[PDB]
Paper text:
AMPA glutamate receptors (AMPARs), the primary mediators of excitatory neurotransmission in the brain, are either GluA2 subunit-containing and thus Ca2+-impermeable, or GluA2-lacking and Ca2+-permeable. AMPA glutamate receptors (AMPARs) mediate rapid signalling throughout the brain, and orchestrate various forms of synaptic plasticity that underlie learning. These cation channels assemble in various combinations from four core subunits, GluA1–4, with each contributing unique gating kinetics, trafficking and subsynaptic localization. AMPARs exhibit a modular architecture with a two-layer extracellular region connected to the transmembrane ion channel (transmembrane domain, TMD). The ion channel is encircled by diverse auxiliary subunits, modulating receptor gating kinetics, pharmacology and ion flux, with the transmembrane AMPAR regulatory proteins (TARPs γ2, γ3, γ4, γ5, γ7, γ8) being the most abundant.
A GluA2 mutant (F231A) increasing NTD dynamics phenocopies this behaviour, and exhibits reduced synaptic responses, reflecting the anchoring function of the AMPAR NTD at the synapse. The Phe231 to alanine mutation, which destabilizes this interface, slowed desensitization recovery of GluA2(F231A), both in the absence and presence of TARPs (γ2 and γ3). The role of B/D NTD interface stability in this transformation is supported by a desensitized (R/G-edited) GluA2(F231A) structure. The NTD dimers of the mutant receptor also transit into parallel O-shape conformations, and the LBDs depart from two-fold symmetry, which again is coupled to an increase of non-domain-swapped receptors (relative to the resting-state receptor). Rotations are larger for one of the two LBD dimers (C/B versus A/D), and movement of the B/D subunits is less pronounced than in GluA1, perhaps due to subunit-selective contacts between the NTD and LBD tiers. Transition into non-swapped LBD dimers probably involves relaxation of the critical M3 gating linkers of the B/D subunits, as observed in an NTD-deleted NMDAR structure, thereby entering non-conducting (‘deeply desensitized’) conformations. Closer analysis of the three sets of desensitized structures reveals a gradual transition of the LBD tier into four-fold symmetry, which is greatest for GluA1 and smallest for the edited GluA2 mutant: GluA1 > GluA2(F231A)-Arg743 > GluA2(F231A)-Gly743.
Numbering used by the authors:
A (entry chain A): 520 to 551, 569 to 629, 633 to 715
B (entry chain B): 765 to 773, 785 to 823
C (entry chain F): 5 to 43, 55 to 84, 93 to 162, 173 to 210
D (entry chain B): 569 to 626, 636 to 666
E (entry chain D): 569 to 617
């Protein structure tokens, strides 16, 4: 749900927040459990995982550091959950002849001498007539000489070619 | 032929959350400044 | 031991300074698919200042990045200038100077604290720089070894800072003995 | 009652961010205040997350604003039609 | 260490339900265990919701 750079910068920020909490909490000599480096790393990790604390900063500087880390955690965790939900929600949702006729970038062809070419040629429906105009004009000749030729041409055109054929052959191919 | 036949036309990224990083680092800086100010003040008071 | 802490602090400071300087200098920040030089597309180093061609008609040619083609304009400005990485290097340098002056002109005991503040601040500057860079690039790819040198610089600098602060704390404990 | 103004502000901020407490009101009235702030935080944060999940899942200005500039062909039925018109727009 | 077996089971259950702790490991090893359990809980509960 979150990009790679976001995770990387979350880790860098965790190290920084911990070091600064240690510095502000213990550098002054006029302040001599409390936040040593180890305890400060623990406070920050626990805050990001929203898993509560055993201690919390008591001084103004410590509380500023804590506050910004808390806000950062809220936005990042909420965003993780929201984007995960969007992934799963969307997942729960060109695929027809008209969509093929509309797309002229993709090339489609048929067997040269076959019921498919004759059916398109003698057709009277608008979609099939547009397809017939395209094939009759689409240079180079989209027509092939054999079904296996169209199979290979599709399997060897980076998906820039489509083949129109009887369903039985497709059913055999998808099953093999 | 001359109009319809010629038709020719997720993972949040730092960019989406950069602001929260900016706020975090800004806060870290403010905190360091406050601490240093307190130290300098209490240091002068330690003179007397 | 107390004597080794100064050695660890000093060697760490030197390492952080060197790593950050090399990263600001070298060009291996982003292995992108770009244009080697204009007047089609190949893998490119694209460091912080100059993007340089590789695997190309003329591999090796390097050019200056065209940062520019209002918040977007200000980001472009902060990215074209590398104020943040450069500031990180400056701060690390001053931190090193403080560590060095820890011995000569000793017994001040605040010069060590200054070293620590400088190292930690260099770290924060390094992270802001990285975020600006990554945000500026977008709007496949990969991050080179200079980008990770920068990151290692941040980690070492934070550690050297923690050691510095620890040393300052110990010096005042001894003074209060 | 260790709730001074600074500690009160810390308690409230920490409750909004759904984070650690470290001190909880013990009196009846302090607990009323805390309860309503808790409920407010639950509804507002739940709705922030829910609406982010929506966001992350789903002019006539011409005359209705002169900043945009509009023009026509110099010699054409369009210029003449506008010139011969009498309608307000 | 107030972490006998009964207290350990309570700490874990509570962490999973995203509720309070009332005690947190203080040693290095205990802290490692706690951290991984916290991460596991975050991912699993976020996914349930």
């Amino acid at each position: 749900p979150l990009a790679y750079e976001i995770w990387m910068c979350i880790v860098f920020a965790y190290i920084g927040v911990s070091v600064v909490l240690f510095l502000v909490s213990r550098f002054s000599p006029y302040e001599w459990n409390e936040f040593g480096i180890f305890n400060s790393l623990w406070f920050s990790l626990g805050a990001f995982m929203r898993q509560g604390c055993d201690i919390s900063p008591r001084s103004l500087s410590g509380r500023i550091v804590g506050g910004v880390w808390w806000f950062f955690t809220l936005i990042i965790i909420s965003s993780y959950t929201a984007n995960l939900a969007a992934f799963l929600t969307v997942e729960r949702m060109i695929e027809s002849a008209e969509d093929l006729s509309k797309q002229t970038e993709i090339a489609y062809g048929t067997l040269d001498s076959g019921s498919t070419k004759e059916f398109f040629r003698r057709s009277k429906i608008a979609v099939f007539d547009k397809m017939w105009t395209y094939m009759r004009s689409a240079e180079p000749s989209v027509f092939v000489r054999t079904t296996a030729e169209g199979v290979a041409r599709v399997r060897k055109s980076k998906g820039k070619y489509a083949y129109l054929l009887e369903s039985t052959m497709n059913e055999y191919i998808e099953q093999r | 032929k001359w109009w319809y036949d010629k038709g020719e036309c997720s993972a949040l990224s730092l960019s989406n959350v950069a602001g929260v990083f900016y706020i975090l680092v800004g806060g870290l800086g403010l905190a360091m400044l406050v601490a240093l100010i307190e130290f300098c003040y209490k240091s002068r008071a330690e003179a007397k | 031991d107390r004597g080794v802490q100064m050695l660890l602090t000093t060697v760490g400071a030197f390492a952080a300074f060197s790593l950050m300087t090399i990263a600001v200098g070298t060009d291996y920040w982003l292995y992108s698919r770009g244009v080697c030089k204009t007047k089609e597309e190949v893998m490119t180093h694209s460091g912080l200042w100059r993007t340089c061609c590789l695997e190309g008609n003329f591999k090796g040619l390097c050019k200056q990045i065209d940062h520019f083609p209002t918040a977007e304009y200000f980001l472009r400005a902060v990215r074209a200038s590398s104020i943040f990485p450069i500031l990180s290097v400056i701060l690390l340098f001053m931190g090193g100077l403080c560590i060095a002056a820890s011995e000569f002109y000793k017994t001040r005991h605040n010069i060590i604290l200054s070293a620590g503040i400088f190292f930690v601040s260099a770290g924060l500057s390094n992270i802001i720089g990285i975020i600006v860079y990554i945000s500026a690039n977008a709007g496949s790819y990969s991050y080179g070894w200079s980008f990770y040198f920068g990151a290692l610089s941040f980690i070492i600098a934070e550690m050297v800072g923690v050691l510095a602060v620890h040393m300052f704390i110990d010096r005042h404990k001894q003074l209060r003995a």
